């Protein structure tokens, strides 16, 4: 009881502290820099293939090669230059709800609703794709599947934890808790020492990958957060929710820099990306089409739509140069 | 494909689609239906044909030349607004409820409640089983269904009791396109596989009328 | 285990019919595509023909056009080569090489053990610059040669393949592309070129690197090789 009170004004303690840092809003500030007019992207590739939903998708670190789980139980690797089929790796379990590319193009990550997150090799000697090793110790569903190397990976599931795994030996070597609720998705910073993860308690909280602690944690959101990514710099990071609203995070600052909020929109945000320089946050949302919003004015700078069902994952070249996106239709379509 | 290497590179991906086609079309013979209900209700010994294959549970029995595949979706212990959208393609839902349990059977309607007016499953039709009606024969006589359900005032007889707990279930519909199809049965029950058939070919009709422009 | 073993070689009269036999244990075979490459004695390798995964597209050197057949049994893991008539020409040491065609594969990597055979009695020209480069341990070596067309495609890619073979072995690849060393290659091997002349470095020599040097282009069929560099200590 008494450490109840204690609880309580230590939010109080954040809350003013937060408060008396902010001085101007962000939308407040830029408000001299020119619009970036309309952002008109035009489909450049369809990539068809899957007989089922689409529900992950990651580039290749080169920007050249897809990588995409359906549940019909499939593994496609494309070649998006030339819509070419470079693998297909049949799947144990038919749930996968994430997907993941290693940074080297060595390996494949890619697990869902069967706990397990596999990982498959794919330069093998003896020419075909096999399963290097099935990390097991989650209770409960997998989602956004992240490499740091080749012998490391971060985990998300709904025990409302996620996990640092030892691919070589197998083990968990670090887990994260803090969450009250299913933890949706999860973004690498760049310099690969720290990471965020949104869960389903409207709140998202920044981790160290190395001391395996909550450095922070932002709120806002009034609906479960759906998707996450950093801002190139790995200074901010941008949040997609249930409640139909994007939202800036500053790491620094600890408070929210700005809202992504149209009323004619319903639907809950899906996926969330950024661009190679930081002005165009990119966003799939439940209505079949993808809006694309000026990350410094909250301007709606064009809409990519073409889908016909829920638009389940977005993706973003390393070099900037093209967007992927996947939807229940069994389409990727790649825009530029 | 203009260069020797792409020529094959080419024909690599050709063969891959092939492949990606056929076996799509073994993908269609087969009936994806969900089991839902409360612990110990029978959502595991439904059907002694089993041949099953923590997590997701499948069981793939055949009948008459139809591949029928049951997932269990219970032991997630998880927000089910999460992946429940997973199973937005079933064909039917399977629902079963223990009539010998007084105490779940509040639990089992809403649990009913949620899962037949959910946005993914407005138009998934419903086949409800009702368990042990021997159990729940023996029951009543000794406590009469009235500790459960205040409201009864018909008659304590098997016939209506039994069909008042039916009645309670279908109130919850409350949905256009939607048939409900129930059917009581007990421990010693071999045919639950032919309800369930033809229940299945049922549905299907319904959604290709729809689909034909019939209604 | 990777391991490609042809049998079948002989001696055998002019006129005659031979089958060679080459059976795969070690690798996924119905996804590879198998070559058949000779090696007459003291004169060097030559590309004959080649089946492509699942038996779809055949090639056949002009040499040998009509004349020799290639069949493929993926289920018995085994490739066949029936020469139908043979001359005085066709004795060479078969090898058996398997290729794997992907946006960033190696479809040179392993070559078989080679099976001798004895018989009693337009496209790109590769030229090497030399025959014998005698050199001592530890200092650098380059190897050169030219071709007719330009092996740079429109694509960006370079379709140069190095192998080495050292005596009493097969060959083994090296750079595949134009720079792109192979799996289990020392680093120290280096590849470069511009279009028509192609340069491979051998920094920090070492004993074993001694053999027969070829560079081999792939940008279009038949497979064409150099003359064949040899080194000396």
């Known amino acids: 009881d008494q450490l109840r009170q204690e609880a309580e004004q230590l939010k109080n303690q954040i809350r003013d502290a937060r408060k008396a840092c902010a001085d101007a809003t962000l939308s407040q500030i830029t408000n001299n820099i020119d619009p970036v007019g309309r952002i008109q992207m035009r489909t450049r590739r369809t990539l068809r293939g899957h007989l089922a939903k689409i529900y992950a998708m990651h580039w290749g670190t080169d920007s050249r090669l897809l990588v995409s789980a359906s549940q019909d139980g499939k593994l496609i690797i494309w070649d998006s230059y030339t819509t070419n089929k470079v693998h297909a790796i049949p799947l144990r379990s038919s749930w996968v709800m994430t997907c993941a590319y290693a940074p080297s193009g060595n390996y494949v990550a890619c697990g869902g609703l069967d706990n397990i997150c596999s990982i498959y090799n794919l330069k093998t000697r003896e020419g075909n794709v096999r399963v290097s090793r099935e990390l097991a110790g989650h209770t409960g569903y997998l989602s956004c599947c992240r490499f740091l190397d080749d012998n490391q990976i971060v985990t998300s599931s709904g025990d409302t934890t996620c996990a640092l795994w030892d691919i070589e030996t197998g083990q968990q070597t670090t887990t994260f808790t803090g969450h009250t609720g299913d933890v949706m998705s999860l973004s690498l910073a760049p310099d690969t020492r720290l990471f965020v993860s949104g869960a389903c308690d409207a709140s998202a909280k920044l981790w160290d990958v190395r001391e395996g602690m909550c450095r922070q944690t932002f709120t806002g959101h009034e609906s479960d957060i759906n998707a996450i990514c950093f801002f190139p710099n790995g200074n901010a990071f941008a949040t997609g929710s249930d409640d139909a609203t994007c939202r800036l995070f500053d790491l620094r600052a600890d408070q929210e820099l700005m809202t992504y909020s149209h009323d004619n929109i319903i639907c809950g945000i899906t996926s969330v990306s950024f661009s190679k320089s930081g002005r165009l946050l990119l966003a799939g949302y439940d209505d079949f089409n993808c809006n694309v919003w000026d990350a410094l004015k909250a301007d709606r700078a064009g809409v990519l739509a073409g889908h016909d069902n829920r638009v389940s994952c977005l993706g973003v070249t390393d070099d900037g140069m093209a967007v992927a996106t996947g939807s229940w239709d069994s389409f990727l379509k790649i825009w530029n | 494909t203009l260069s020797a290497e792409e020529r094959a590179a080419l024909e690599r991906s050709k063969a891959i689609e092939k492949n990606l086609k056929e076996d799509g079309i073994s993908a269609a013979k087969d009936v994806k239906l969900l089991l839902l209900g409360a612990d110990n209700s029978g959502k595991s010994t439904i059907v002694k044909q089993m041949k099953i294959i923590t997590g997701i549970v499948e069981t793939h029995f055949t009948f008459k030349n139809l591949h029928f595949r049951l997932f269990d979706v219970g032991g997630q212990r998880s927000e089910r607004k999460k992946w429940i959208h997973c199973f937005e393609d079933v064909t039917a839902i399977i629902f079963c409820v223990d009539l010998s349990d007084y105490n779940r059977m509040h639990e089992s309607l809403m649990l009913f409640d949620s899962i037949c007016n959910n946005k993914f499953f407005i138009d998934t039709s419903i086949i409800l089983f009702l368990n042990k009606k021997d159990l729940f024969g023996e029951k009543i006589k000794k406590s009469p269904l009235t500790i459960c359900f205040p409201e009864y005032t018909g008659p304590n007889t098997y016939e209506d009791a039994a069909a008042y707990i039916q009645a309670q279930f279908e109130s919850k519909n409350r949905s256009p396109n939607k048939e409900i199809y129930c059917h009581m049965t007990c421990a010693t029950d071999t045919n639950n596989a032919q309800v369930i058939f033809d229940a299945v070919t049922d549905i299907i009709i319904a959604n290709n009328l729809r689909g034909c422009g019939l209604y | 285990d990777v391991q490609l073993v042809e049998s079948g070689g002989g001696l055998v009269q002019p006129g005659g019919s031979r089958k060679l036999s080459c059976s795969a244990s070690?690798?996924?075979?119905?996804?590879?595509?198998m070559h058949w490459v000779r090696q007459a004695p003291e004169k060097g390798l030559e590309w004959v023909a080649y089946?492509?995964?699942?038996?779809?597209?055949?090639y056949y050197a002009d040499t040998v056009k009509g004349r020799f057949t290639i069949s493929r049994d993926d289920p018995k893991n085994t490739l066949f080569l029936q020469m139908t008539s043979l001359r005085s020409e066709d004795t060479a040491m078969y090898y058996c090489?398997?290729?794997?065609?992907?946006?960033?594969?190696?479809?040179?990597?392993?070559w078989g053990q080679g099976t001798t055979l004895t018989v009693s009695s337009s496209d790109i020209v590769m030229t090497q610059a030399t025959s014998s480069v005698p050199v001592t341990p530890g200092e650098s070596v380059s190897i050169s040669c030219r071709s007719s067309?330009?092996?740079?495609?429109?694509?960006?890619?370079?379709?140069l393949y190095w192998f080495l073979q050292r005596p009493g072995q097969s060959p083994q690849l090296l750079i595949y592309?134009?720079?792109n060393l192979a799996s289990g290659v020392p680093d120290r091997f280096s590849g470069s070129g511009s279009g028509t002349a192609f340069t491979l470095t051998i920094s920090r020599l070492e004993a074993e690197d001694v053999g027969v040097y070829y560079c081999?282009?792939?940008?279009?069929?038949?497979?064409?090789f150099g003359a064949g560099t040899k080194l000396e200590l």
């Open positions: 089946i492509s995964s699942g038996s779809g597209t055949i």
């Open positions: 070690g690798f996924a075979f119905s996804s590879f595509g």
């Open positions: 592309r134009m720079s």
């Open positions: 067309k330009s092996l740079l495609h429109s694509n960006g890619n370079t379709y």
């Open positions: 081999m282009q792939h940008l279009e069929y038949p497979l064409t």
């Open positions: 090489v398997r290729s794997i065609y992907y946006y960033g594969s190696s479809p040179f990597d392993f």
